[PDB]
Paper text:
The non-structural protein 1 (NS1) is secreted from the infected cell and is thought to be associated with disease severity besides its proven usefulness for differential diagnoses. NS1 can be found intracellularly, where it is essential for virus replication, docked on lipid rafts of the cell surface membrane, and abundantly secreted into the bloodstream of infected individuals during the febrile phase. NS1 is comprised of three distinct domains, an N-terminal hydrophobic β-roll dimerization domain (residues 1–29) formed by the intertwining of two protomers, an α/β-wing domain (residues 38–151) that extends out from the central β-ladder domain (residues 181–352) giving the dimer a distinct crossed shape. Here, we present high-resolution cryoEM structures of ZIKV recombinant secreted NS1 (rsNS1) and its complexes with three human monoclonal antibodies (AA12, EB9, GB5), as well as evidence for ZIKV infection-derived secreted NS1 (isNS1) binding to High Density Lipoprotein (HDL).
Residue numbers in the entry:
A (entry chain K), B (entry chain L), C (entry chain B), D (entry chain C): 1 to 352
Write the structure that this text describes.
């Protein structure tokens, strides 16, 4: 708790005791290493799960998906060692990571033998097997969405003084729609508080009342935001959560904005996204009762690239509500083009 | 907002951005300028308060006593320019700081006079007067409680922690029974959370769904704890708040103890009270079905120096709750002497 | 070795792994507390030296004087336990320290028995004897300079998790004239190189040239600066070293300035000498080739404190050169008063 | 600079002023920008070099090769925008990185076109040209090493080096084979001295003499170690410098070990080479005078991977020297296999 505290705004070097949080979403690339636990038990789990008619796993976040491409060789070799013919295939995730009903069973006992964890686990290869245990990817045709597992892992301990934090995880014996709290946090001082998650960072201020300031989205989950680590969980609803609750929208006075509602058809397809309260270049948003009602988020740019400099709506706190996507700006549901037809603009992917 | 941390149980160090809280209950605040609005307006408060039957004040906290005392002499000189004859007397604060049905009014007009109230170069005095506005102490007869005010102040600024360190203030224009949220510090992470203010420190560990861990009291206020800043506002009663809400007992699951109720008869008199869950020296608390019922906290130390060692109770949980006061050790209401008469021991006067 | 970092010039906070120097010049007062290892062997060495004709020891560093003063009692008691007729008297510290031809011999064997000294180092009782194994002091008549032992010691271990990190020395097995490398640390980074040790602190930077900026001289030694721990020791002249080599002047480009010759006649009688390049208060220096020639340095004021305000220099580059001592503001030799008799100028004592 | 320090063998901790070194070899540093002065000045320099007849550039180090990989596209776009037709093509660094005799001429005047590409990070295309100003890569035939430049840049300033982490370079006016000192750190404390730069990490231990302890290499350059930035620069011979000076072998007694000689023919082709004084896995080294004389470094294993169990040496001192790279474990010149056919010994190709 002994800290370098140096007030950047006022240049105040100080130290003492308290609690400390750090912005790791941008520093995530060079801070984190992940892995499963007991790969033999995981081989037992995948084998047993295969006995339950399980296709694969549709990862909800990039953290888990990046895990499942780490012990694929070791998992396949362990399956080979005990004679289990099972090949795991891992593809690419696509936002918004949808909700899979199945859940990975938990073995009651490990495989009868196997000690490949000693020495060499990485540089291992084995021939494919007819059976495929797919992970993410565009294998929607190979198997439907109802045979895929989802949110069947946990974080018990992470962080190490080895320059590269190694994270311990294991298959859930429980069923949950809630996002993992081991890697979430917020706290408040005076006028400022912020909701922080590995794939979601949210800025909350107190200008007049407690409101929202900004949010960044690297990944597009489908779990639920908690209330225990949420501030002011008393007197708040889901519709005003600009972040959809189904998309893990916090239930706080700090997750609400005036003149705007939950955005379910937003650019939940974009791999990367940010919610900035700024008019996108060359686009001025108006507020007029004459304007149209809400509609699916339309990108600021037409397919031809021409920009639309006139956007309107009825009951918005002007001017901006635009998603900072890689492909451009997506505007909120209330904001709709004033003159450009709503069918001409790049409509957001169906992600309600 | 950029500082570091050095964990105790682990030597790992790392840092960047973050939010930070500090503890200032051990240091009993610190030397602060204590500008109440304007000293001329503060003096003009008492002319009309005194006129409408306010013969004294019951200070809510020790800060307030410091504040009135620190300007007591100057208050006598501000009113020398106009035909006002008052003399302010500030006495030691008796605990627990009972309430005052009156409040300090808010003058609407200023007295035309020199503005030398603040920053005077000394060399000035005032004329004493028979009528006395008694501020706490032993002026119960000189001023009835019904004519005393209380909790009639509101904090505005408490910054300038580098050089000026002024606790700027204003008479709260609003009759508030709750405490002031500004100087409160709190946050929760992992298995830990802790509230903090100018007179109290609170700890909360995720022992089993959170509970009461340890707190210290340097002053027994009689305000109330706001919910929008306390964890789990919903889901706790005021009776199981081991701190009576009357004493600003927080309304949170984190503020409660198994087998212990609100300690209304606790030693809220001892100017300082440290709340620790531990057997006091030389006492063995028992859990017997045949023990006695609740009662006012009996100090573990007798007036003659003898100490009653073996105590019992019917609904306790280890470790026992004993108020570590300068007066000695005081146990909870639930824990009574096994067989030594409660009359002989130093009973805690009913502190409701 | 990891650690914090704060560069106040840019406020750049850093943490990694490497080496960490410290500025301990101000901490010479109470940096260390210790005695030489096996004071019995040092007593044997002192007896052998005295038998060999070592009337005294000329302390080379104030650290050595501190150690000798601290260990005087234990050494005396060791001498008088074995029956040795020797009293070790440790005098004051006079600047500049002057060399001692002789050295402390390493004793072939320790004294037959000196266990009573074990655990009896500071609070040590003994008597006096006719023979005085003086240690520096104002005893030039008694033990002349040529008959004093000097720089015949070494350092084994220093630095610890304590304010007074115990230092263990050793009777130098052989001759030596250089200074101690173990307590030296240095390096260069961009535009700043600093030469620092237990008693000195020298600065340098590249202002279109690597020149001298400021040097703090708590003491005045005569050993030689080692090359193994020096920067840019290639192509530098003694006469341009503002600090002469005879007073332990580093041999580096960073230890010289332009338009100024070596200062061999400066206030080298000053106990504490700090060197800065800034105009002396209450005076001014002109670049006048008609000024005085080279010679002893002068104090800015007269004996009575009269401020000699008129000064000049043959070819100095403004700002001028002056010595800051406890005595007062002393000028460089190249600067002379435009109009002041040499009788009114205090000449810096010069010792060879 | 205010930092801290925590010991590893011990647990001593402390914070204070000083200077701090940081090892970025294993820590893998951070991302860097590598801005080459004014992009148009670089374009003019390369155009003038091509007019002179410079066919390409030899990236001395991996940092400069990454700089050219980051600067290629925008330089080509700038060239095509101006009346210039020359394409820059980069590739992979080949070890050992070879020298070049040419330097990029400093342009007299900037190319006549608009300035819009300060630190332009790609994302602009250009028309290919038959003429190519190849950079490193494998275009040896297209641009012979004769007309390949080498060390044509110098680091100027490291502005915003904590987060922005940008290294700004400019075309050197004068020729210089020397490496870059600004990115070199070193000092000595007690019995350890360490030499390192942006690419190299050398550990020297004092074991009865200042001796090397370990040497790790992530690249293979050909510049030269500056003397001002190393220790014990006297009484050192190249033959005992295990690292050849041609490999920027530091000139210090710390760079030599007894019983061995310079290794100018070792596995310097390795992209990563870690030198450890230890027997190669599955191999035994002995000291036999009848052993083969010094010869090219041989991988401990064979081409098929067979391990040589018996090894001999004429003058080696245990533990034996071995180069630990991804290719495998090697042996020095003095260490020859005791009895093994020379065909199966993977010689290190001569690095001339
Ligand atoms: C006697 C003891 O160790 N008690 C603790 C309990 O207070 C805590 O809540 C629990 C959490 O699992 O761990 C145990
Ligand atoms: C923000 O500052 C204060 C606090 O809410 C208020 O006066 C103001 O209206 C707020 N909004 C703006 C746009 O300044
Ligand atoms: C160096 O110092 C001189 C005068 O001492 C000053 O004019 C100049 O600006 C300084 N800086 C540089 C980079 O020369
Ligand atoms: C290393 O340790 C010390 C000197 O540094 C000494 O005892 C020992 O002999 C040295 N040599 C070896 C091989 O450890």
């Amino acid at each position: 708790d002994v800290g370098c505290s140096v007030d950047f705004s006022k240049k105040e070097t100080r130290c003492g005791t308290g609690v400390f949080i750090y912005n790791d979403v941008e520093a995530w690339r060079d801070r984190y290493k992940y892995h499963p636990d007991s790969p033999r038990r995981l081989a037992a789990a995948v084998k047993q799960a295969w006995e339950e008619g399980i296709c694969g796993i549709s990862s909800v976040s990039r953290m888990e998906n990046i895990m499942w491409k780490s012990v694929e060789g070791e998992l396949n070799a362990i399956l080979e060692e005990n004679g289990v013919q099972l090949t795991v295939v891992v593809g690419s995730v696509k936002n918004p990571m949808w909700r899979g009903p199945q859940r990975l069973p938990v073995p009651v006992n490990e495989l009868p033998h196997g000690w490949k964890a000693w020495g060499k686990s990485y540089f291992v290869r084995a021939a494919k097997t007819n059976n495929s245990f797919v992970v993410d990817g565009d294998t929607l045709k190979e198997c439907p969405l109802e045979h895929r597992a989802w949110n069947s892992f946990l974080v018990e301990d992470h962080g190490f003084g080895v320059f590269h934090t190694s994270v311990w995880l294991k298959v859930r014996e429980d069923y949950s729609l809630e996002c993992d709290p081991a890697v979430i946090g917020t706290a408040v001082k005076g006028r400022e508080a912020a909701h922080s998650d590995l794939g979601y960072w949210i800025e909350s201020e107190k200008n007049d009342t407690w409101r929202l300031k900004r949010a960044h989205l690297i990944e597009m989950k489908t779990c639920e935001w908690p209330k225990s680590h949420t501030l002011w969980t008393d007197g708040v609803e889901e519709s005003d959560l600009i972040i959809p609750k189904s998309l893990a929208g916090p239930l706080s006075h700090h997750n609400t904005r005036e003149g705007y509602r939950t955005q379910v058809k937003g650019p939940w397809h974009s791999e990367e996204l940010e919610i900035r309260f700024e008019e996108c270049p060359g686009t001025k948003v108006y507020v007029e009762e004459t304007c149209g009602t809400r509609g699916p988020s339309l990108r600021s740019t037409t397919a031809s690239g021409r920009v639309i400099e006139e956007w309107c709506c009825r009951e918005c706190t002007m001017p901006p509500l635009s998603f900072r996507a890689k492909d451009g700006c997506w505007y909120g549901m209330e904001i709709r083009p004033r003159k450009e037809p709503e069918s001409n603009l790049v409509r957001s992917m169906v992600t309600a």
